Design a protein around this nucleic acid. Structure first.
Ligand SMILES: Nc1ncnc2c1ncn2[C@@H]1O[C@H](COP(=O)(O)OP(=O)(O)OP(=O)(O)O)[C@@H](O)[C@H]1O
Ligand SMILES: [Ca+2]
Ligand SMILES: [Ca+2]
Ligand SMILES: [Ca+2]
Ligand SMILES: [Ca+2]
Length: 341
DNA sequence: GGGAAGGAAAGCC
DNA sequence: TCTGGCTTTCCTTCCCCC
């Protein structure tokens, strides 16, 4: 199998640069303003001009401004990025019927039936990069290898505006030399548990007692890492279908007063229904982020679709259950719908 | 013994 | 200072079915 992975560069910030070319060369920071106070919220992303200074996804906007007070700060316009992403995904479908859209800016294409070797795969990658640059002015990084995981690692190694092939020989080298923390699916918590077992490389998971590995990181992640280390990871490219849609908002001030929370909860329901667009959910979950930042949720599944009026009434009962069962104040409140008909 | 199902944990965008 | 958002697996409990 030959997998070609596409990952758009500094996507949100780059789209803003495409829509306003005068921004190019300047540090641009895309913000997610929570509306709680002046500049409260976090950075969604920033272009490398800003990132090279530590301004990146997830840091508080206030911290970003301490680092680059003169950068351009723009509020996220997800809908615009989503429409642009959709057009690019449509261009990629021309290169393969087997495509897995993984996120707003990533796609895996199985090009096994399209090219004969990595030389041809590489040339197709260039063709794709040029087509997207021609049509949308967006640069991307392409990663090519024998499976999805290595195709993604290839992209990580080449971004931004790059292309890289990790052939069979290099896959074996990486199994021995790649920091295991850099393997997709291994976050800080799993990386710490592994470091604690002396596991710093994929190859190391083959010499540890399986039960010891499984007991520390779980059966699925252990089987996952071992399959990669054995160079036997096989996962087909599959069409993805969204399984959940929701909206969660930040309240002006923390609270556990039902009447004060309701307006936010109902606003989150309205926006969620707008985002469902014809999809009818059979399940609704009310999700609350407590003052200490913990996440609590209560849901209900119906034997039928949930009308908006039913979403309103059931959401209150679920929020009451959250308040009746938890003692903390709520900071953020929302809903999530799933189990579509 | 183990499949489902609810909610938390963890991962990545 | 900690936005928003989606997916998958984990842990626990029910019950032989969902
Ligand atoms: N923590 C986050 N909060 C809000 N939006 C995010 C977050 N992480 C990523 N995104 C959005 O999704 C997009 C893709 O994620 P990614 O981590 O690839 O960022 P990027 O800006 O595209 O950087 P890169 O050049 O590494 O590909 C970004 O433009 C942004
Ligand atoms: Ca990525
Ligand atoms: Ca990207
Ligand atoms: Ca990692
Ligand atoms: Ca049951």
């Amino acid at each position: 199998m030959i997998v070609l992975f596409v990952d758009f560069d500094y996507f949100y910030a780059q789209v803003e640069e495409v829509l306003n070319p005068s921004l190019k060369g300047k540090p641009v920071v895309v913000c997610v303003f929570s509306g709680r106070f002046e500049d409260s919220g976090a950075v969604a992303t920033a272009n490398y001009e800003a990132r090279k200074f530590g301004v990146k996804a997830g840091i508080p906007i206030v911290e970003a401004k301490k680092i680059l007070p003169n950068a351009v700060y723009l509020p996220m316009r997800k809908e615009v990025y989503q429409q642009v992403s959709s057009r690019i995904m449509n261009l990629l479908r021309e290169y393969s019927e087997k495509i897995e859209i993984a996120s707003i800016d990533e796609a895996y294409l199985d090009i096994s039936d399209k090219v004969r070797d990595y030389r041809e795969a590489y040339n197709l990658g260039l063709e794709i990069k040029n087509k997207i640059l021609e049509k949308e002015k967006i640069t991307v990084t392409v990663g090519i290898s024998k499976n999805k995981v290595f195709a993604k690692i290839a992209a990580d190694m080449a971004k931004p505006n790059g292309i890289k092939v990790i052939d069979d020989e290099e896959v074996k080298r990486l199994i021995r030399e790649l920091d295991i923390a850099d393997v997709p699916g291994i976050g800080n918590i799993t990386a710490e548990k592994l470091k604690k077992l002396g596991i710093n490389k994929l190859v190391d998971t083959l010499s540890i007692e399986f039960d010891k590995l499984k007991g520390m990181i779980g059966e699925a992640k252990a089987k996952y890492l071992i399959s990669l280390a054995r160079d036997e990871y096989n996962e087909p490219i599959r069409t993805r279908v969204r399984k959940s849609i929701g909206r969660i908002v930040t309240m002006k001030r923390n609270s556990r007063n039902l009447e004060e929370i309701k307006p936010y909860l109902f606003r989150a329901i309205e926006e969620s229904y707008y985002k469902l667009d014809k999809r009818i959910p059979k399940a609704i979950h009310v999700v609350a982020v407590t003052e200490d930042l913990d996440i609590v949720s209560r849901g209900r599944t119906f034997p039928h679709g949930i009308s908006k009026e039913t979403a309103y009434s059931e959401s209150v009962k679920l929020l009451q259950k959250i308040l009746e069962e938890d003692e903390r104040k709520i900071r953020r409140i929302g809903v999530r719908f799933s189990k579509f008909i």
